[PDB]
Design an enzyme around this catalytic site. Sequence first.
Site, PDB file in Angstrom:
ATOM      1  N   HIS A  45       0.813  -1.291   0.649  1.00  0.00           N
ATOM      2  CA  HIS A  45       0.304  -0.016   0.429  1.00  0.00           C
ATOM      3  C   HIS A  45       0.812   1.084   0.138  1.00  0.00           C
ATOM      4  CE1 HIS A  45       0.339  -0.200   5.253  1.00  0.00           C
ATOM      5  NE2 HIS A  45       0.393   1.577   4.257  1.00  0.00           N
ATOM      6  N   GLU A  59      19.718   6.599   7.435  1.00  0.00           N
ATOM      7  CA  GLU A  59      19.365   7.292   7.635  1.00  0.00           C
ATOM      8  C   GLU A  59      18.904   7.308   9.513  1.00  0.00           C
ATOM      9  OE1 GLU A  59      18.359  10.503   6.933  1.00  0.00           O
ATOM     10  OE2 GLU A  59      16.662  10.526   5.868  1.00  0.00           O
ATOM     11  N   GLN A  64      17.412  16.619   8.641  1.00  0.00           N
ATOM     12  CA  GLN A  64      18.971  17.352   9.051  1.00  0.00           C
ATOM     13  C   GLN A  64      20.483  16.192   8.777  1.00  0.00           C
ATOM     14  OE1 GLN A  64      21.680  17.938  12.828  1.00  0.00           O
ATOM     15  NE2 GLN A  64      19.248  17.643  13.959  1.00  0.00           N
ATOM     16  N   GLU A  69      24.074   8.813   5.125  1.00  0.00           N
ATOM     17  CA  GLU A  69      23.196   8.306   4.263  1.00  0.00           C
ATOM     18  C   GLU A  69      23.279   7.925   3.220  1.00  0.00           C
ATOM     19  OE1 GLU A  69      23.145  11.424   5.640  1.00  0.00           O
ATOM     20  OE2 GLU A  69      21.721  12.262   6.694  1.00  0.00           O
ATOM     21  N   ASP A  93       0.015  -7.534   1.889  1.00  0.00           N
ATOM     22  CA  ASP A  93       0.409  -6.083   2.183  1.00  0.00           C
ATOM     23  C   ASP A  93       1.962  -6.381   2.019  1.00  0.00           C
ATOM     24  OD1 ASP A  93       0.249  -3.166   2.119  1.00  0.00           O
ATOM     25  OD2 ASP A  93      -0.236  -3.298   3.525  1.00  0.00           O
ATOM     26  N   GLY A 186       2.778   6.517   8.242  1.00  0.00           N
ATOM     27  CA  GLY A 186       4.388   6.279   8.473  1.00  0.00           C
ATOM     28  C   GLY A 186       5.583   5.407   8.759  1.00  0.00           C
ATOM     29  N   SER A 188       4.445   2.315   7.921  1.00  0.00           N
ATOM     30  CA  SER A 188       4.480   1.265   7.640  1.00  0.00           C
ATOM     31  C   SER A 188       5.119   0.808   6.264  1.00  0.00           C
ATOM     32  CB  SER A 188       2.859   1.607   6.699  1.00  0.00           C
ATOM     33  OG  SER A 188       1.804   2.355   7.081  1.00  0.00           O
ATOM     34  N   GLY A 189       5.501  -0.712   6.480  1.00  0.00           N
ATOM     35  CA  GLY A 189       6.534  -0.738   5.731  1.00  0.00           C
ATOM     36  C   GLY A 189       7.264  -1.096   5.940  1.00  0.00           C
TER      37      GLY A 189
HETATM   38  C1  LIG Z   1       0.501   1.711  11.789  1.00  0.00           C
HETATM   39  C2  LIG Z   1      -0.232   2.620  10.642  1.00  0.00           C
HETATM   40  C3  LIG Z   1       0.023   1.262   9.424  1.00  0.00           C
HETATM   41  C4  LIG Z   1      -1.528   2.878  10.333  1.00  0.00           C
HETATM   42  C5  LIG Z   1      -2.480   1.694   9.344  1.00  0.00           C
HETATM   43  N1  LIG Z   1      -2.556   2.633   7.825  1.00  0.00           N
HETATM   44  C6  LIG Z   1      -3.425   1.722   6.882  1.00  0.00           C
HETATM   45  O1  LIG Z   1      -3.010   0.387   7.063  1.00  0.00           O
HETATM   46  C7  LIG Z   1      -2.904   2.562   5.813  1.00  0.00           C
HETATM   47  C8  LIG Z   1      -2.994   1.775   4.142  1.00  0.00           C
HETATM   48  C9  LIG Z   1      -4.183   1.639   3.899  1.00  0.00           C
HETATM   49  C10 LIG Z   1      -5.723   1.219   4.504  1.00  0.00           C
HETATM   50  C11 LIG Z   1      -6.320   1.017   2.946  1.00  0.00           C
HETATM   51  N2  LIG Z   1      -7.810   0.759   3.985  1.00  0.00           N
HETATM   52  N3  LIG Z   1      -1.811   3.187   5.563  1.00  0.00           N
HETATM   53  C12 LIG Z   1      -1.544   4.015   5.709  1.00  0.00           C
HETATM   54  O2  LIG Z   1      -2.504   5.754   5.191  1.00  0.00           O
HETATM   55  C13 LIG Z   1       0.587   5.232   6.240  1.00  0.00           C
HETATM   56  F1  LIG Z   1       0.218   6.528   5.843  1.00  0.00           F
HETATM   57  F2  LIG Z   1      -0.067   4.593   7.719  1.00  0.00           F
HETATM   58  F3  LIG Z   1       0.639   4.472   5.127  1.00  0.00           F
HETATM   59  C14 LIG Z   1      -3.630   2.572   9.186  1.00  0.00           C
HETATM   60  O3  LIG Z   1      -4.138   3.579  10.094  1.00  0.00           O
HETATM   61  N4  LIG Z   1      -4.345   1.646   9.150  1.00  0.00           N
HETATM   62  C15 LIG Z   1      -5.823   1.764   8.637  1.00  0.00           C
HETATM   63  C16 LIG Z   1      -7.300   2.720   9.316  1.00  0.00           C
HETATM   64  C17 LIG Z   1      -7.348   2.907   8.267  1.00  0.00           C
HETATM   65  C18 LIG Z   1      -8.545   1.497   7.638  1.00  0.00           C
HETATM   66  C19 LIG Z   1      -9.307   1.673   6.504  1.00  0.00           C
HETATM   67  C20 LIG Z   1     -10.562   0.794   7.094  1.00  0.00           C
HETATM   68  C21 LIG Z   1      -9.923   2.493   5.885  1.00  0.00           C
HETATM   69  C22 LIG Z   1      -7.454   0.348   7.390  1.00  0.00           C
HETATM   70  C23 LIG Z   1      -6.152   0.523   7.710  1.00  0.00           C
HETATM   71 CA   LIG Z   2      19.415  13.109   7.635  1.00  0.00          CA
END
Ligand SMILES: CC(C)C[C@H](NC(=O)[C@H](CCCC[NH3+])NC(=O)C(F)(F)F)C(=O)Nc1ccc(C(C)C)cc1
Ligand SMILES: [Ca+2]
Length: 240
Positions: A45, A59, A64, A69, A93, A186, A188-189
Site C-alpha cells: 500500500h 538514515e 538533518q 545516508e 500487503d 508513516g 507502514s512498510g
Molecule cells: C501504522 C500504520 C500502519 C497505520 C495504518 N495504515 C494503513 O493501513 C494505511 C493503508 C491503506 C489503508 C486503506 N484502507 N496506511 C497508511 O495510510 C500509512 F500512512 F500509514 F502508510 C492505518 O491507519 N490502518 C488503517 C486505518 C483505516 C483503514 C480503512 C478501514 C480506512 C485501514 C487501515
Molecule cells: Ca538525515
Amino acid sequence: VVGGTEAQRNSWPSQISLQYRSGSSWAHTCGGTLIRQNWVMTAAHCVDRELTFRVVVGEHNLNQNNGTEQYVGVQKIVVHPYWNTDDVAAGYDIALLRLAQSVTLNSYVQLGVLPRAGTILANNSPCYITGWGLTRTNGQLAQTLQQAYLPTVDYAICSSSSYWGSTVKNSMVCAGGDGVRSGCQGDSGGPLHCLVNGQYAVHGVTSFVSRLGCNVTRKPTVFTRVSAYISWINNVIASN
Ligand SMILES: CC(C)C[C@H](NC(=O)[C@H](CCCC[NH3+])NC(=O)C(F)(F)F)C(=O)Nc1ccc(C(C)C)cc1
Ligand SMILES: [Ca+2]
C-alpha cells in the site's frame, strides 16, 4: 511510533525510509527493510500512488545531515499479485523494490535477517517496531528514528472478539495493543524486529492500525507475516 524512544544510530541498520517527490523536495511516506544490497521489502500500500520514490539507507534524522545516508532511486516495484488496494484486511500487503544501484554495507547499512518459512512466534514474544511515523494519533512524523517494545499477540487472541476479530488473518502478526505504544502513519512498510535464538529477525512488515487511532487498547498494530512469504520473496529476487 507512539510511545517510542529514540533509537541509537546503529541499532537497526536494515531500516530504510521510503520517500516520494513532493514538488521540489522529497518527503518520507513509509519505512522498509533492506533485504539485499539492491532490494527493499516494504508494504504494498505504500507504493499504490504512482509517485516517484526514493530510498534512503543509513538514515537517522529525516531533517538533518547525519553524514551516513545513501540515496538511491527505485528502479522497479513488484507488488504481491494478490494485493488489492481496497482490501488491507485480506492481507498480501508486501512489495519488493529493486533499487537503481547496490548500497554500500557498513555499521549503519546492513541487511535484515528474515525468518524461516512457516515460523510463528509464541504469544508475548519480545519485538521492536521502528520508524519515523507519527508520534501521536493525528500528530506529526518523528525527526529521529523511534523504537517501541511491542510484544506479539498470537493469532488466537488477536482474531478474537475484543481484539481484531475477523479483520486479522493467519498471514499477519499482531503486536502490542496496550494503548500506549504502537505503529502509526508513516511507519507502514517498516520492520517488526523480534528476538529469536539470540538474533533480531524481521518478522513483520507494518501494515495497519485502528481507524480509531494508533494506540488503542486491544487493537495491536498489524503486520504482514514475513515468514508466510519467503518463497514469494526468493522467487522475485531469483527472476528479477
Ligand atoms: C501504522 C500504520 C500502519 C497505520 C495504518 N495504515 C494503513 O493501513 C494505511 C493503508 C491503506 C489503508 C486503506 N484502507 N496506511 C497508511 O495510510 C500509512 F500512512 F500509514 F502508510 C492505518 O491507519 N490502518 C488503517 C486505518 C483505516 C483503514 C480503512 C478501514 C480506512 C485501514 C487501515
Ligand atoms: Ca538525515
